[PDB]
Symmetry: D2
Subunit: 332 residues, 4 copies
Amino acid sequence: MHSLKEEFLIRLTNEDLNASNKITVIGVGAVGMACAFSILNKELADELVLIDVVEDKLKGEMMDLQQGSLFLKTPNIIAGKDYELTANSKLVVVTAGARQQEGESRLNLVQRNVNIFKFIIPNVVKYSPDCILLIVSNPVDILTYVAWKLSGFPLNRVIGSGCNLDSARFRYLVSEMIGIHPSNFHGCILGEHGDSSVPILSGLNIAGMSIKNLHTDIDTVFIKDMCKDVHKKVTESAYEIIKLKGYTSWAIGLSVGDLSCSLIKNLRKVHPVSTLVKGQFGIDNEVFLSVPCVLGRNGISEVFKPKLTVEEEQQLKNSAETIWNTQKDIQL
Amino acid sequence: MHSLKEEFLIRLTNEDLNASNKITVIGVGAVGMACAFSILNKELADELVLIDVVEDKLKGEMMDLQQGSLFLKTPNIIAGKDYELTANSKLVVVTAGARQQEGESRLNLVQRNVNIFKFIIPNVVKYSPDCILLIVSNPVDILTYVAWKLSGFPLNRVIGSGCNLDSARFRYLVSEMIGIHPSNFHGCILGEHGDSSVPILSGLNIAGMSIKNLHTDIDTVFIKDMCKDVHKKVTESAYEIIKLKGYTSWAIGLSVGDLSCSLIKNLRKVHPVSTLVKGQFGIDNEVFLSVPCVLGRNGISEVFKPKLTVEEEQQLKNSAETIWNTQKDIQL
Amino acid sequence: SMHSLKEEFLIRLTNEDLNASNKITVIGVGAVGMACAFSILNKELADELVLIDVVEDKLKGEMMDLQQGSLFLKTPNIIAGKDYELTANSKLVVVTAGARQQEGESRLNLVQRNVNIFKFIIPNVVKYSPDCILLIVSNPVDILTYVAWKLSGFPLNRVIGSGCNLDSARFRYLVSEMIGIHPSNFHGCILGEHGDSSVPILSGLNIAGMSIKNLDMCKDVHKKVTESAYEIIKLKGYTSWAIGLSVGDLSCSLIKNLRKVHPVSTLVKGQFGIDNEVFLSVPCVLGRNGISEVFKPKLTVEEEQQLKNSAETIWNTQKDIQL
Amino acid sequence: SMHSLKEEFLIRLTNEDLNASNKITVIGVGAVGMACAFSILNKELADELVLIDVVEDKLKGEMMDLQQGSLFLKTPNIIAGKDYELTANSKLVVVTAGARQQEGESRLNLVQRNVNIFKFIIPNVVKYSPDCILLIVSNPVDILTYVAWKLSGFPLNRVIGSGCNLDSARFRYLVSEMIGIHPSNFHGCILGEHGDSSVPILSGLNIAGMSIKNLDMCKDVHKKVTESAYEIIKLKGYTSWAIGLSVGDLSCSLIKNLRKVHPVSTLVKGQFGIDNEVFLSVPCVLGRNGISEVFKPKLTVEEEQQLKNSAETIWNTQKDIQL
Ligand SMILES: NC(=O)c1ccc[n+]([C@@H]2O[C@H](COP(=O)([O-])OP(=O)(O)OC[C@H]3O[C@@H](n4cnc5c(N)ncnc54)[C@H](O)[C@@H]3O)[C@@H](O)[C@H]2O)c1
Ligand SMILES: NC(=O)c1ccc[n+]([C@@H]2O[C@H](COP(=O)([O-])OP(=O)(O)OC[C@H]3O[C@@H](n4cnc5c(N)ncnc54)[C@H](O)[C@@H]3O)[C@@H](O)[C@H]2O)c1
Ligand SMILES: NC(=O)c1ccc[n+]([C@@H]2O[C@H](COP(=O)([O-])OP(=O)(O)OC[C@H]3O[C@@H](n4cnc5c(N)ncnc54)[C@H](O)[C@@H]3O)[C@@H](O)[C@H]2O)c1
Ligand SMILES: NC(=O)c1ccc[n+]([C@@H]2O[C@H](COP(=O)([O-])OP(=O)(O)OC[C@H]3O[C@@H](n4cnc5c(N)ncnc54)[C@H](O)[C@@H]3O)[C@@H](O)[C@H]2O)c1
């Protein structure tokens, strides 16, 4: 057919060329495939590239996706081990690495996944020097810092998925108690994507009403008690799902599709994602953790530098100390 | 063909039946068609019915829409003057009536459009006793009250589009100054959909941060001054567009698609829409104005009764007095 | 507590607690069931999604994982459990439960195992949603659609097998890659068994309103289609993403009442010389009543012979089933 | 002020101020231009939408009305003005400006008026976006696509007329209503002039991969298609919604690089015995380079004769134009 379509088609552009929205996902595991599936459902890429080190699972996942192309708007889905396939990617989503066993801290994955990053990131930069890096692998705050150092990239193009998912979980749990859609409850989780994350009690809001304005009995103590209980469920959520299911995949897939949407579509939406926060909250080491960031086609265009409460800043400084305690021990 | 498809098709259900998401738009003017177009783009209806009193414009608009059905997911688009077409509608959007001339207050449309409603609403109720009424016609707060009285409906199924659009305008103007997407700036406008509407200064928020927490200099006076200027632009917006363009259509079309989405899809999202607020803010007459409401397939499932600031409650009481000053003079 | 204060800062206007209007149940939270659930959620088809299985822990873990992405969805209630009372009044029930293929194993070899599973599932589905649409995905999909019809007592319009919607998608993708166009503009039909004896309707091939004759190896492509599942199973262990997307496609047409045409499994006795109660894929019109119309196409002699053989291959396994 | 404080509560990480990656310009903010703009906005195709016209007040009013719905959109910059510097570096330029039909008036009678308008528009477009794709909508679309090609000096792949994408949609809708299926599963092509001499490709008709022959009055339907615009113009004064949706459809394929097939206006010299530089609708493959491929179909004798006549009818008006 490649021989005979040459005479019921007139070619007007002898020069086919690159894709304008090429997205690469590294790692075709549970998280990688959920991210790729969410990115495809959002119609964000005209070319999707999958990279891994297990050839047979790579090819099977690729074929499975490819074969649903009737139902999608991504005309090129490709997969392999050779980073040449990723050349000139707009966005590279790194999901590769060790994941938590039951009861295991994300921080206990750091040495295994730094070693993996030492190989992945140089190869990414080689073929896509201008891409945005979106880090998902845990521990995400440390591996975003690591990716930043290994890549030589400016801060705007090295992003960790961070607390976008923790914040979505938090907003789900609170809106569940009220009986409204999570999109109309506003609250954010900042700091470590882990046990030391920080609820921003001062900013809880429903559809343009400060939480304190809903009811006379919703005072500072009520809010501290509520969030004490809700935040415990947030920090525990991943552990319980790992005990029950083995891993998490669907919610982070949706979160990464959310972040990719703002990045690819240049929306300048605000997300709590991992970036360098030296200079904020009394932090003086080169620690990355989640703060609100404006996202668009240049990556992080702006970082918020808010004036939060004394307690919130101190909890964030403590979160940075926890990260640094692990980060100081890695060798690059 | 209706004769010959009878032998390359086997009918398995001799009994075709009603539509599950039948939506009627009354009025095929600028607002009605923008609403119908937005409802179609959201794929909310399997049957869309258009009602008006001008037969030729009715048929032309119907055909124009019908002919783009390849690109839509609404298999039945129909139009006419006979309310029998609307039978068993889930949702009825009323956009019919006089609109503002240059400089004209929405309240100056009340007698003309009450008279129009005296004919429309009884006919709607006759063929769709269980529908949700969504009132768009101005002055929207008074005509929602009027529709409530004429219909005999419970409060949950009589909704005015209210300040959903005013709030969208407000969030656009503020987020424009910051340089972020309006979806991440949270602020609401309540009260009259008109000159006496009320910005809720106490609830301004960016992506889970209270506005006061962005910068030490953002204090109560800064916020009052900012909103003084922004709110003036909000109340003026419709007048300027009417002077320049003759009318407004696109933003209210999108707003009504937003409200219809929450209603049809049962999302329990919160919108500032017009409902009865006797019993709130010191209001003791049967005044409708915009307060935050939970919307789903039963219409308004819940109304927020917030504890706003003294000034906000007083501005809302004044807004209700302004509405009542006009509403007391209509005869039903 | 926020549970107690909401009782005071919200005024309920309705003391009615109606039922969801687009309640969708997925039976089986395996690889296929979750891919189906995820696609249905992405298409915003349900205001209530129910997941049923027999492994409590995996159920709850999958439910929690989906729930926690609710901010990015338009489905306000996601629930999971073992009790079919959770499924009551479902509009659509997608059955993905059962044994799946090992490497190189015919789908037909699964049938007696999955008949046994269906003898439990279907009567429990019908007890709580007697007016629902059944969409069968478990293999072998053509026989198990027949089984579901017999156990449920439903009319034929409300018992549908996912059939060759997926096989056709694969066919259209493969041909479209050779031409260099998007698969939605290549129109090619695969009918018959979802399996080794499927039939490409080469007489119907068309590009954007041009018949082939307006413009051998299309049999070669069909062979790649029949082998595709085996290849992926060998490489990956199973398939999930394409069938999830195909089920979401079918679900869209059913839930949104689109009257779209899909090659799905339904009774074809009376067509192509088939006198036994065999289900296989023919094109059907799908909407909120299920299959409203079935196409009676006049195919070539070779194509109707190939369909009769397909029916005989199915019947050869179906006839041995104790039901 | 909030303008001054944002300078302090945000840290800029980029002092680069790049250019939008999907900048779309619509020339003409009349009924067609705004319906096109609204559909493009609903499809979230552009991060920057530019509206150009020559009536300052209506421009600003339409811009403000669109802008104020931004919360419900995914287009962060919407701008409008008279100055083509606003359009710089546009990926796609949709030209809807010009005279439209009065009741009963041939589209061909508009051409000399709209050629004059194009002699101003096109050189200004090309000055500021030399690499853009031109999508011509103004009537008569087939001649004005030729005109745009000649004035712009663009290659043929980047000068596209909306052509019979709309006429085909109308044809498919009308036939689909008689059968009772969704129009996306009926495949029928209308080629030639967007106008009175269009040509139904009855040899290519197909339902979901079944040729008609697998299953007179399809000429009757085509007559309803040619008359449809006149009827709506008589009833409503103009048309807008269907062409807006059709332009959004074409724009989707171009902007998202889908390689979908549409019947659009392009040069057909060398086909169907046409020796003049006539543009009319044939099926074309659309992506981010514009038209990458044009179909050379082998139609029936009656269909190629009907296309030649269509070409002659177009040429009869086109030959009289001073350019
Ligand atoms: N940031 C979050 O919110 C979040 C949520 C869930 C999981 N995670 C993390 O995502 C990561 C992956 O989790 P998972 O469930 O997908 O695990 P998984 O076991 O399913 O997949 C991991 C993939 O990484 C591949 N891989 C390993 N080394 C590689 C290398 N040098 N190059 C390319 N690919 C390589 C593996 O072959 C494997 O396919 C883990 O670190 C997990 O902790 C993060
Ligand atoms: N709530 C809002 O935010 C908002 C925004 C914009 C406009 N509006 C209001 O929407 C209403 C319509 O505005 P428009 O721009 O579409 O005006 P329009 O002139 O374009 O259309 C009004 C339509 O109402 C029809 N109509 C009149 N009487 C009727 C009757 N008894 N039954 C059925 N149809 C009847 C008319 O034939 C006409 O087609 C006005 O009241 C306007 O003030 C409200
Ligand atoms: N029609 C198609 O195109 C297609 C495509 C792929 C797979 N399949 C078939 O789908 C079915 C499932 O495949 P899979 O990969 O998800 O397998 P899986 O093993 O991953 O999941 C199977 C699920 O079925 C559950 N189950 C078993 N008995 C049950 C019962 N009485 N009630 C409720 N749930 C029960 C299991 O606990 C398990 O969770 C198989 O039959 C497979 O062959 C069909
Ligand atoms: N291809 C199709 O299928 C199709 C369908 C419908 C209409 N049309 C055609 O689209 C064109 C516009 O139709 P309409 O209903 O929007 O007319 P309209 O009168 O409502 O709008 C025409 C716009 O063109 C503007 N304009 C005039 N000169 C201009 C110039 N130098 N530069 C920029 N703008 C200029 C006008 O100011 C006006 O705003 C007509 O030619 C019509 O026949 C084509």
